[PDB]
Amino acid sequence: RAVTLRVLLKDELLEPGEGVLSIYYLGRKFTGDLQLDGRIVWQETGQVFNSPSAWATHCKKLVNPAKKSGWASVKYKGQKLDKYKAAWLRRH
Amino acid sequence: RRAVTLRVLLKDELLEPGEGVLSIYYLGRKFTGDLQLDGRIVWQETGQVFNSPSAWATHCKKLVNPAKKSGCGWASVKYKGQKLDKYKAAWLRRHQ
Amino acid sequence: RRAVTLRVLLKDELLEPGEGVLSIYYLGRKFTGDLQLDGRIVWQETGQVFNSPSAWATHCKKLVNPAKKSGCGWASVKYKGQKLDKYKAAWLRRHQ
Amino acid sequence: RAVTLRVLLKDELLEPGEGVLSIYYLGRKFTGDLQLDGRIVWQETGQVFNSPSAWATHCKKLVNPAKKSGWASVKYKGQKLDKYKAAWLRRH
DNA sequence: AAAAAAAAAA
């Protein structure tokens, strides 16, 4: 039963909002809005992403195109999404 | 593919950055903010920087009514006396 | 949820299997069929097997009248002198 | 506009009838009646299914309960339903 | 009719 941002928002481990997702890589700050459907809006361009890993690999490739590869890079209100994946596996 | 943000509204030149251009009117209270080129907002009173219209709106309204719950603050924020949500609507039509 | 078939009629014991039990009378001509426990029909003349009373009814009527167009054969088929459609109605009554 | 047995029947790709739909799985032969509304009646039990997939997963789970999973399994007068799906996409 | 939740497969 693979864990998605949709499960988390539904099972209330997360709350949707503007500029609640962030990535720091080699000096560039990326900020993301979380929609109720769990899709991510990159503020800078408004381009929509389906998964943390989609958004993270797009952003990191802009800074270092050699970077081949989500839940460890993307933070939600100061904490990594993995801790929110973990939290859910413990509740369910 | 693409959703509206303050930064998308700045790139399409639908909005212009500057001092006191943003405003909220809530229960006889007026809050004014500055719009930055990077789409972030500065609340004039504290000089505090917010990352969203929501985040600034939820914060200001919490100071006048402490039982004010979180939600989308595009509906309550004006740019030069007109509703942000109209700039969103203008962009959505502009780019069908 | 549920709809009538020869097999549902067999389960509810509304029909008994056997030789010669089925019959069609079309333009002064008679055809007879055996009803199997699996609900398939055997045409006595050729020993040919059909999935439904329809399939059998259109095949037999097309030999006496090559125009006759396809459709539901329940209306035309008799089980021991009574219309198969009466066994359908008697089942629907019992169940609903 | 996703293709259903109703569309095929309505657009005359399929003809409704008794014992016109069939499945063969591990020795069990299943036979279906196609209704004008595009719903499937399973001859053996008279139980009514809304989709080829609903009928196929039900019948097969009876043979092999570890089979989790329509248009490839269910045949119409000797050919697979997917061929009638493909035919409609060309005709429309 | 739309809106949203699910089994392989790379």
Place this chain on the structure above:
DNA sequence: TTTTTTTTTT
């Protein structure tokens, strides 16, 4: 992990 598409539900 994610990316895919039919179907049930309304």
